[PDB]
Amino acid sequence: EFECESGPCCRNCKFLKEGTICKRARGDDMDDYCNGKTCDCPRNPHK
């Protein structure tokens, strides 16, 4: 039927809009955001 996975950046087998915050950073860092492709909250590379 559908390719379905769950995680912070998915809801009911759909991907949350790219750029959606999924984990607020400590200090001055870039926040983690959903990529609109995968269900995990990707740990930002740029820190």
Numbering used by the authors: -1 to 45
Question: Which of the paper's sentences describe this entry?
Answer:
Echistatin (Ech) is a short disintegrin isolated from Echis carinatus that contains 49 residues with 4 disulfide bonds. Ech is the most extensively characterized disintegrin and has a conserved RGD motif and a long C-terminal NPHKGPAT tail. Similar to the reported structures of other disintegrins, Ech has a well-defined core composed of a series of nonclassical turns crosslinked by disulfide bonds (C2-C11, C7-C32, C8-C37, and C20-C39). The RGD motif is located in a protruding loop that is formed by two antiparallel β-strands (residues 16–20 and 29–31).
